[PDB]
C-alpha cells in the first residue's frame, strides 16, 4: 500500500524494493510478494508485466550478472510476470544484453542462446551474432563503460570475449551510430544529487561518447578527461549533432514503441538520454535538439508514470535553453500543467512549481514578452498558486492583459495543434469572455479571427474529441452569433515562382514552414525523420551559407546569409537553422517500376501509385536543379500537399525538346484516369481513398493555376509593353490551352460533389462552361446537382412556375403555396420545401401548428429517413414553445431506434434541456446542454476556405441560444443574476444587430428569464420580453411570442404587440 500511495519515481523505487523482498532467497517472502503484487496489479487495473516492466529492466540488470545460478529467480520472475522469457528479452534487450556482455568472460550469452534454442541446437553462435547485430550499440557503450577502455586491442578482445562472429575487426564503422550514441546517452542514469559513483559513471559514459570511430583504428582508456582536446570540440559536436537526430529518433523508437510489450521504463530512459545530451552538449547540439524532441518527451509526459521524470527533463531543458529562444515549446508545458493540475500530486506539483519559478527567475522576457497568453493563463488558473510562487509578478500579468489588445495572440496560440494546448486555450477563452461579458468589454461596438480559429479546431475534430468539441462549441456560443457587421469575418499569398533567386528562396521559406513544422515537427517514424534530415540538408544547401562559417554577427563579414535568415521568419529560422551544421548526402537512387498504368491507379489510389508517380515526375523535371528533387524519398503523411507542391515544373515546355511535356500530358491523363475510376459501384474503399486523390488533383490544378496567375500579375506590375517577351506568352497560353482542353465535365462534377466540397466543381465547371453552347442545352444532366450540393454548402411545368416569388421579398404567397401543397401531407420533397421555406423567415409556431403529431396520431412514428420535418420543426417549438409545447413534441421526437440524425438531435437536446428546466434542475440541464454542444460542435461545422458564416446562420444562432440556455460562470451567482438583467442588455453587443438572429437587446433577455422561471422569476419571464419585439413583416412568430407574454400584462410587451401589428403595415389601429 505504501507503493500504492507513492507516485511515479518513489513508487518505482519501492516496487524495486518489493521485487527485492520477492527474490529474497525464501519461499515465504517470495510468495507473499507474489500475492501482493498480483493483487496490486489487477486491482490497479493494470497487468503485472505492465507494472513491472517499469522496474524489470533494472531487475534483469541486477540479475543478468548471475543468471546461470539464478534460473530459479528468473523463472519465479517470469511466472509472476505472466509472460515468457523471450517477450521481455527482446522488448528489453536494449538493457539486458549490454549488461550481460561485460560480466565475467565465462559469459551467460551462450546460455541465453540456448534459451533461444531450447527445442533445438541450431547454432548458439548464430543466435548470439544476430542478437549482437540487433543490439550492437549499448554493447560498445558498456565495453567502454562497464569496464572502461578504448584501446582497440582489449576493446576488440572484449567484443569477441565469447562473440567471435563480430569479426572482420569491426563490422560497418558505426561506433558513432545514431543508435550507438542514443543507447549510450540513454545510460545517463542521473538522480537528484551527485553521488561519487553516479557522477563518475556519467563522466565515463561521456568518455565513451568522446571515443568514436575516429580513433577506433588508430588508438588511453577514456576513463578520465586527461585525454580530451579543447579544440576538436566544435567539429566534435558537429558530428554529434548529426548524431542527435537519429539519437532521439531511436528515442521515439523506444517510446513510440509499437510493440506493446514496451512500457515506460524505456520512456524515462529516453528522459535520461535527452538530459545527458543537452547537458554535456553545447548550444548547437541543444538547438538541433528541438524539433522532434518535444514530441518524444511529450509522449513520455502524457504517460502517467513518467510524468515526474518528464518534468525533470523538461526543467533541465528549461535550464538548457534560455529566454530569447525556445518560447515555441512553453505552450505544451503550461498547457499540460494547467490541464492536469487537478491531478498533480505533491512531487509533481513542486517540480512544476520549480519549472515556473525557474521560468520567472530567467525568462520573464520569454513568458510575458513573447507568449502573453502564458501569463494570462498562469493567472487565469490561479488555484495552482502562481501568486504563491511569485506574487509580485501579478502586477506584470496585469500589465500583460491591459497593455495588449491580445485577441490575435489568443487566436494564434489557439491555432495550436493538439488537444492539451488548445484545451487550456479554450479554458482561458472561457474566463476571458466571462470577464469581457461581465465588464462589457469584449471589443464589439481578432475576436472574429479567434472565433474562426476555434471553429477550425472544432472541424479538425469533426469526428474527433467530442469533449473539446463541446468546449469549443460553448466557446463559440459564449463569443456569440457574429454576422461580420461590427467586425469582419476573414479567411495564394506572396509573389512566387521557380525561376529567380530571392523569390525561389521565399518559396522555400514557404516550403520549410509548410512541410517541416506541420508534418515533420509532427512525424513519428524514425526512418521518416531521417528523411526529414535529408530534405533539410537540401534546404540548408539551397540556403547554403551559415552552414560552413557564417554566424550571427561574430564577424559580420558578409550580409548575404544574414539577410537571408533575417528575411526568414523566426519560427522558420529556429526550426531549421540548427541543422545547418549537418552535411549529409543521399544514395544511389532506387528502382523505377514505370508509370502511366491506370490499373494500378485504380487498385492503388494514393497509397503508393501517385507517390511513385510524383517520384518519377520530380526526378525527371528538376534533377537536383531545385530543392524539389531529393524529397524523392517521401517514404503517406504530407500527401495531398506535396503531389501538387512538386507539380509546377511545366515552364520548361516552352520549346520542350524533352519528354517533359510528354509526361505533362501523361500526368494530366493519369489524373483523368483517377477520374475514370468513378465509384465503379463500390463502397467506402472508393468513397475515401480515390476521393482524397480527387482533392489531391484539385490542389494540383489549383496550384498550376495559381502559379500562372501570379506569373502574370507580378511580371506586369512595372509596365505592360513586353507582352510576348521571348516565348513566355506561348508557354503560358499553351498550358492554359491544355487546361481548357482537359475537362471531363460530367465525371468531374459528379465526383466533385461526391466529396463534401463545392468550389472544385464550381471552378472546373466554370471554365468548361466558358466552353459551352450559348443556349443552355448541355445543362440537362448537370442542373439537378448544384440544387443538392447547395442544400449543405449553404450558398443557397406548373409547380416549376409557382416558386417564382418564393423568397423574393414577398413570402406569404409562395409560402402558403407550400403550406397548401403540403396539406396533402403526401409529397415529402415539397414537404421539406414547405417547412424550410416557412422556416427561413421564422414562422416557427405555424411550423409546430402544421404538426402531424398533436393530431389524430402522433407524428411520423419512429421517424425513418423522413425525419427532416422534425428537424425543421423542433427548433420551431424550441424557441417558440413552452412546458406543454416542448414536452408534447419532446415525447414525439425521440421516436427513432438509432441516434442517426444530427439536426433534429441537436434541437432534441435543447428541447429536452427545456423540459429539463421544466423539471427545474439547472445543473443537469447544463448536462443536456453539454450533450447539445458536443453534438453541434462535432457534427455541424466544417473548415474555412469554403463558407463565410452568413450560411452557418442556423448553426451559430443555435450556439448563441445554447449558452443562454445553460451556462454558469459569469452569471452563476445570484448577485450576478440581478445585475445580469442589466448585463443581458449587453448580449446584442457580442451577438450583433441583424434581425435574423443577431439582434439580442432584450430578445435574448426574453430567454434568460424564460430559462430562469420560478414563481417570481416565472412572472418575470414575460416581463423580460419588454423590448424583445422591438425588432419585429414576418411577425407571425413575434405575434405568438407576444401573446404568450401579454398573458402577464406587461405594458412594454403590449406596446410591442401594437408594434408588430403596425409593422405589418397599418397606421391608425
Amino acid at each position: 500500500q505504501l507503493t500504492l500511495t507513492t507516485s511515479n519515481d518513489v513508487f518505482d523505487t519501492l516496487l524495486l524494493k518489493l521485487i527485492d523482498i520477492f527474490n529474497s532467497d525464501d519461499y515465504s517472502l517470495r510468495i507473499m510478494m507474489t500475492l501482493q503484487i498480483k493483487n496490486m496489479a489487477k486491482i490497479l487495473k493494470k497487468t503485472p508485466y505492465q507494472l513491472l516492466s517499469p522496474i524489470l529492466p533494472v531487475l534483469l540488470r541486477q540479475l543478468g550478472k548471475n543468471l546461470v545460478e539464478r534460473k530459479v529467480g528468473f523463472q519465479n520472475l517470469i511466472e509472476l510476470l505472466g509472460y515468457s522469457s523471450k517477450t521481455i528479452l527482446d522488448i528489453f534487450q536494449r538493457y539486458i544484453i549490454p549488461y550481460a556482455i561485460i560480466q565475467y568472460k565465462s559469459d551467460v550469452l551462450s546460455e541465453i542462446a540456448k534459451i533461444m534454442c531450447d527445442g533445438d541446437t541450431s547454432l548458439i553462435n548464430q543466435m548470439k551474432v544476430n542478437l549482437l547485430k540487433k543490439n550492437s550499440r549499448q554493447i560498445f557503450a558498456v565495453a567502454l563503460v562497464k569496464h572502461g577502455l578504448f584501446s582497440l586491442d582489449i576493446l576488440e578482445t572484449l567484443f569477441l570475449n565469447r562473440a567471435p562472429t563480430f569479426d572482420k575487426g569491426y563490422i560497418t564503422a558505426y561506433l558513432p551510430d545514431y543508435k550507438t550514441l542514443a543507447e549510450i546517452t540513454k545510460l545517463y542514469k542521473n538522480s537528484v544529487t551527485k553521488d561519487a559513483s553516479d557522477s563518475e559513471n556519467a563522466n565515463m559514459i561521456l568518455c565513451s561518447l568522446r571515443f568514436l570511430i575516429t580513433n577506433f583504428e588508430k588508438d588511453s582508456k577514456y576513463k578520465n578527461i586527461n585525454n580530451w582536446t579543447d579544440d576538436q570540440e566544435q567539429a566534435f559536436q558537429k558530428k554529434l549533432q548529426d548524431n542527435i537526430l537519429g539519437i532521439f529518433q531511436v528515442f521515439s523508437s523506444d517510446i513510440h514503441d509499437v510493440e506493446g510489450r514496451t512500457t515506460y521504463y524505456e520512456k524515462l530512459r529516453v528522459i535520461n538520454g535527452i538530459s545527458f545530451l543537452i547537458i554535456y552538449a553545447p548550444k548547437k547540439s541543444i538547438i538541433s535538439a528541438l524539433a522532434q524532441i518535444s514530441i518524444c518527451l511529450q509522449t513520455g509526459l502524457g504517460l502517467k508514470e513518467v510524468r515526474y521524470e518528464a518534468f525533470r527533463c523538461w526543467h533541465l531543458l528549461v535550464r538548457h535553453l534560455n529566454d530569447e529562444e525556445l518560447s515555441t515549446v512553453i505552450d505544451s508545458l503550461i498547457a499540460f500543467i494547467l490541464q492536469k493540475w487537478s491531478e498533480f500530486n505533491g512531487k509533481l506539483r513542486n517540480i512544476v512549481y520549480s519549472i515556473l519559478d525557474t521560468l520567472i527567475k530567467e525568462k520573464s522576457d520569454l513568458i510575458l514578452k513573447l507568449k502573453p497568453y502564458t501569463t494570462l493563463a498562469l493567472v487565469g488558473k490561479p488555484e495552482l498558486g502562481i501568486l504563491a510562487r511569485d506574487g509580485q509578478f501579478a502586477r506584470m500579468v496585469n500589465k500583460i492583459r491591459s497593455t495588449t489588445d491580445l485577441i490575435p495572440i489568443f487566436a494564434n496560440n489557439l491555432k495550436s495543434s493538439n488537444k492539451y494546448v488548445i484545451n487550456q486555450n479554450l479554458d482561458d477563452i472561457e474566463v476571458y469572455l466571462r470577464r469581457k461579458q461581465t465588464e462589457r468589454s469584449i471589443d464589439f461596438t481578432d475576436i472574429t479571427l479567434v472565433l474562426g480559429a476555434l471553429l477550425d479546431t472544432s472541424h479538425k475534430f469533426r469526428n474527433l474529441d467530442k469533449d473539446l468539441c463541446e468546449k469549443c462549441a460553448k466557446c463559440i456560443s459564449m463569443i456569440g452569433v457574429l454576422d461580420v457587421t461590427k467586425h469582419e469575418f476573414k479567411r495564394e499569398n506572396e509573389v512566387y515562382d521557380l525561376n529567380d533567386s530571392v523569390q525561389t528562396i521565399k518559396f522555400l521559406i514557404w516550403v520549410i514552414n509548410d512541410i517541416l513544422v506541420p508534418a515533420f515537427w509532427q512525424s513519428e517514424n524514425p526512418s521518416k525523420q531521417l528523411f526529414v534530415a535529408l530534405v533539410i540538408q537540401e534546404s540548408l544547401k539551397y540556403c547554403g551559407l551559415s552552414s560552413e562559417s557564417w554566424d550571427m554577427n561574430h564577424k559580420e563579414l558578409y550580409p548575404n546569409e544574414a539577410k537571408l535568415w533575417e528575411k526568414f521568419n523566426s519560427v522558420s529560422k529556429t526550426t531549421i537553422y540548427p541543422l545547418l551544421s549537418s552535411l549529409y548526402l543521399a544514395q544511389s537512387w532506387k528502382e523505377y517500376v514505370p508509370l502511366k498504368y491506370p490499373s494500378n491507379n485504380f487498385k492503388e489510389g494514393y497509397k503508393i501509385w501517385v507517390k511513385r508517380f510524383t517520384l518519377d515526375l520530380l526526378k525527371t523535371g528538376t534533377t537536383e536543379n531545385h530543392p524539389l528533387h531529393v524529397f524523392s524519398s517521401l517514404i503517406g503523411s504530407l500527401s495531398n500537399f506535396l503531389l501538387p507542391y512538386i507539380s509546377l515544373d511545366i515552364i520548361i515546355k516552352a520549346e520542350k525538346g524533352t519528354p517533359y511535356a510528354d509526361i505533362l500530358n501523361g500526368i494530366i491523363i493519369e489524373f483523368d484516369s483517377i477520374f475514370t475510376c468513378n465509384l465503379e459501384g463500390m463502397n467506402n474503399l472508393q468513397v475515401d481513398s480515390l476521393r482524397m486523390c480527387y482533392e489531391s488533383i484539385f490542389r494540383v490544378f489549383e496550384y498550376c493555376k495559381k502559379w500562372a496567375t501570379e506569373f502574370k500579375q507580378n511580371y506586369s506590375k512595372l509596365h505592360g509593353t513586353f507582352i510576348i517577351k521571348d516565348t513566355k506568352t506561348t508557354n503560358m497560353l499553351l498550358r492554359i490551352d491544355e487546361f481548357l482542353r482537359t475537362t471531363p465535365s460530367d465525371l468531374l462534377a459528379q465526383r466533385s460533389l461526391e466529396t463534401d466540397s463545392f468550389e472544385r466543381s464550381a471552378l472546373y465547371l466554370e471554365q468548361c462552361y466558358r466552353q459551352n453552347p450559348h443556349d443552355k442545352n448541355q445543362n440537362g444532366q448537370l442542373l439537378k446537382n448544384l440544387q443538392i450540393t447547395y442544400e449543405e454548402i449553404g450558398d443557397i411545368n406548373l409547380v416549376s412556375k409557382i416558386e417564382e416569388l418564393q423568397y423574393s421579398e414577398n413570402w406569404k404567397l409562395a409560402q402558403d403555396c407550400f403550406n397548401v401543397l403540403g396539406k396533402f401531407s403526401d409529397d415529402p420533397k415539397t414537404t421539406t420545401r414547405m417547412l424550410k421555406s416557412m422556416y427561413d423567415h421564422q414562422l416557427y409556431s405555424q411550423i409546430i401548428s402544421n404538426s402531424s403529431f398533436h393530431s389524430s396520431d402522433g407524428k411520423i412514428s419512429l421517424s425513418p429517413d423522413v425525419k427532416e420535418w422534425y428537424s425543421i420543426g423542433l427548433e420551431a417549438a424550441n424557441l417558440e414553445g413552452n412546458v406543454q409545447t416542448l414536452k408534447n413534441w419532446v415525447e414525439q421526437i425521440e421516436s427513432l431506434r438509432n441516434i442517426d440524425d444530427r439536426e433534429v438531435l441537436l434541437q432534441y437536446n435543447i428541447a429536452k434541456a427545456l423540459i429539463a428546466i421544466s423539471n427545474e434542475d439547472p445543473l443537469r440541464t447544463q448536462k443536456y446542454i453539454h450533450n447539445s454542444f458536443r453534438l453541434i460542435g462535432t457534427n455541424f461545422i466544417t473548415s474555412s476556405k469554403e463558407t463565410t458564416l452568413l450560411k452557418k446562420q442556423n448553426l451559430l444562432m443555435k450556439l448563441h441560444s445554447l449558452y443562454d440556455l445553460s451556462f454558469l460562470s459569469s452569471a452563476k451567482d445570484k448577485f450576478e443574476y440581478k445585475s445580469n438583467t442589466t448585463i443581458l442588455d449587453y448580449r446584442m453587443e457580442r451577438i450583433g444587430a441583424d434581425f435574423v438572429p443577431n439582434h439580442y437587446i432584450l430578445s435574448m433577455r426574453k430567454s434568460f428569464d424564460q430559462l430562469k422561471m420560478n414563481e417570481q422569476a416565472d412572472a418575470d419571464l414575460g416581463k423580460t420580453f419588454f423590448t424583445l419585439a422591438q425588432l419585429a413583416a414576418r411577425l407571425d412568430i413575434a405575434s405568438e411570442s407576444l401573446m404568450h407574454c401579454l398573458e402577464r400584462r406587461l405594458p412594454q410587451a403590449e406596446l410591442e404587440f401594437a408594434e408588430i401589428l403596425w409593422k405589418q403595415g397599418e397606421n391608425d389601429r
Binding site: S28, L35, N463, K912, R934
Partner: protein
C-alpha cells in the same frame, strides 16, 4: 419466448454493443434517451429475467423430463445474446450483465440438477461453456467504483449501471429504479400516444449514496452468484474439460485474493454494508478453492500451478495467520470490532429482535449466550481473523497438503512461523 427475445436482442445490437468510450469517430451525442434506451434495455433485462423464470419452470420441473427445453438453439441464441451483453469490447450495462450471468447461473444449476447429465453435457459444447467463462472471468475481474458508478467510468472494468440506463429488473431490484419514476412519466397517461412519453437519460440521475450502497450490495451478491456458479461448474465436471483447466484455480483464487487484499486494505475500515456479505462469500470462494484443490486436484498441472502458485499459497497463508487468536477468544472487545465494522449487522441484530422475528423479543437466555460469541466471530470474519474452525482448517489444509509441493518443505517453517507450526 426464450429464443424469441434472444433474436430480439440480436435485433437491438446497437445499445448492448455501444463503444466502450465512444472512440472519437463514435460519439455519445445520443438524444439523452432512456426513452428508447428503456425500450431496448427493458426488453433485454425483462426477457433475461423471463429466461431465468423459464429455467425455473424447468428448474423445479421434474428431472425425468429434462431432455426437451435444452437444445443447441437455446445454447446458440444465448451465445449471441450473452456475447452482445457481456461486451468485452464495448460499454455494456449492468442490468443486462446481471441478467446474462444469472441466466448462466440457472443454466449451470440445471446442468447439475439434470439426472441423465452426460448426454446434455455433451450437448452443451465445452468451447461454449468456455465462451461463457472467458466473459465471466472477465466479469469477476471487472470492478466496482461506487463514487462514479453513476458516471461514464473506465473501459468496462467499472460495473456502473449508469443512471443513463437505470431501473430495477424483475426478480431483483439493483438500481434506484429512478427511471421507474420516469415510467411514471412513460406515456402521456392522458393521451393515446403513438410514440411514448420520454424517460430521459439525463433527467434520470449528496442525496442518498445508500443508492450506490444497495446496488453494490447487489454487485456483491452478483459475485456471490458468480463464485457459486463457477463452483457449480466445478461440480458439473468431476472429470472435466477446457472450462476448468486450472483456470478455475487461476481466476477463482485471483478473485479470492483480490478480495482478501481489498477487504483488508480498504473495506474493513471502509466498514460499510458490504463487509459481512463479502467476507462470508469470499471465505466461501476460499472453500471453492479448497474442494477444487482436493478433489479436482487431479487436473491442475505444473504450468498453471506455476502461473498462480503465488495467489494460491499466500491467500491460504493470509487466512492461516489467525487460529490461535490470543486477542479475545470471547466477547470483550472483539465486540468493539463488531461495532467498528459489524455495526451494520448490529443494526441487523437490533432490527431482527425489535422488528423482524416473532420470537426474538424477550430473549430466552439460551440465545444471547450464543450471540456474544457468534456475532463476534461474524465480525472477526469481517476483520480477517477468527474464521470458523471449519474455515481456518480449510485454508490450512489447502496449503499444508504436502502431497503436492505447493510449499517448499524447507520453507513451510518460515511460512507457518508467522503463526506457529
Amino acid at each position: 419466448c426464450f429464443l424469441f427475445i434472444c433474436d430480439l436482442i440480436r435485433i437491438y445490437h446497437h445499445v448492448l454493443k455501444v463503444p466502450i468510450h465512444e472512440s472519437n469517430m463514435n460519439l455519445h451525442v445520443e438524444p439523452q434517451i432512456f426513452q428508447y434506451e428503456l425500450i431496448d434495455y427493458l426488453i433485454i433485462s425483462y426477457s433475461f429475467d423471463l429466461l431465468e423464470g423459464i429455467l425455473r419452470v424447468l428448474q423445479s420441473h421434474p428431472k425425468q423430463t429434462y431432455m426437451e427445453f435444452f437444445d443447441e438453439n437455446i445454447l446458440k441464441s444465448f451465445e449471441f445474446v450473452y456475447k452482445l451483453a457481456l461486451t468485452i469490447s464495448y460499454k455494456p450495462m449492468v442490468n443486462v450483465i446481471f441478467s446474462a450471468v444469472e441466466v448462466v447461473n440457472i443454466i449451470t444449476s440445471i446442468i447439475l440438477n439434470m439426472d441423465n447429465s452426460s448426454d446434455l453435457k455433451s450437448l452443451i459444447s465445452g468451447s461454449w461453456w468456455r465462451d461463457c467463462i472467458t466473459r465471466l472471468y472477465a466479469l469477476l475481474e471487472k470492478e466496482i467504483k461506487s463514487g462514479d458508478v453513476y458516471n461514464e467510468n473506465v473501459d468496462t472494468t467499472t460495473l456502473h449501471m449508469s443512471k443513463y440506463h437505470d431501473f430495477f429488473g424483475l426478480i431483483r431490484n439493483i438500481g434506484d429504479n429512478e427511471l421507474g419514476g420516469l415510467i411514471s412519466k412513460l406515456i402521456y397517461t392522458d393521451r393515446l400516444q403513438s410514440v411514448p412519453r420520454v424517460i430521459s437519460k439525463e433527467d434520470i440521475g449528496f442525496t442518498a449514496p445508500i443508492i450506490g450502497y444497495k446496488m453494490e450490495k447487489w454487485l456483491l451478491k452478483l459475485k456471490d452468484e458468480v463464485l457459486n456458479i463457477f463452483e457449480n461448474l466445478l461440480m458439473i465436471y468431476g472429470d472435466d474439460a477446457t472450462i476448468v483447466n486450472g483456470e478455475m484455480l487461476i481466476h477463482s483464487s485471483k478473485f479470492l485474493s483480490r478480495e482478501q487484499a481489498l477487504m483488508i486494505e480498504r473495506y474493513v475500515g471502509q466498514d460499510s454494508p458490504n463487509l459481512d456479505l463479502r467476507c462470508h462469500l469470499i471465505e466461501h470462494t476460499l472453500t471453492i478453492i479448497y474442494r477444487l484443490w482436493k478433489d479436482h486436484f487431479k487436473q491442475l498441472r505444473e504450468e498453471q500451478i506455476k502461473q498462480v502458485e503465488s495467489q494460491l499459497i499466500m491467500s491460504l497463508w493470509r487466512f492461516l495467520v489467525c487460529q490461535t487468536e490470543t486477542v479475545t477468544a470471547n466477547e470483550r472487545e472483539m465486540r468493539d470490532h463488531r461495532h467498528l465494522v459489524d455495526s451494520l449487522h448490529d443494526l441487523t441484530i437490533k432490527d431482527q429482535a425489535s422488528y423482524y422475528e416473532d420470537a426474538f423479543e424477550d430473549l430466552p437466555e439460551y440465545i444471547e449466550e450464543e450471540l456474544k460469541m457468534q456475532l463476534n466471530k461474524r465480525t472477526g470474519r469481517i476483520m480477517q481473523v477468527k474464521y470458523d474452525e471449519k474455515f481456518q482448517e480449510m485454508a490450512r489444509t489447502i496449503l499444508e497438503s504436502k502431497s503436492f509441493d505447493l510449499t517448499t518443505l524447507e520453507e513451510a517453517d518460515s511460512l507457518y512461523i508467522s503463526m506457529g507450526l
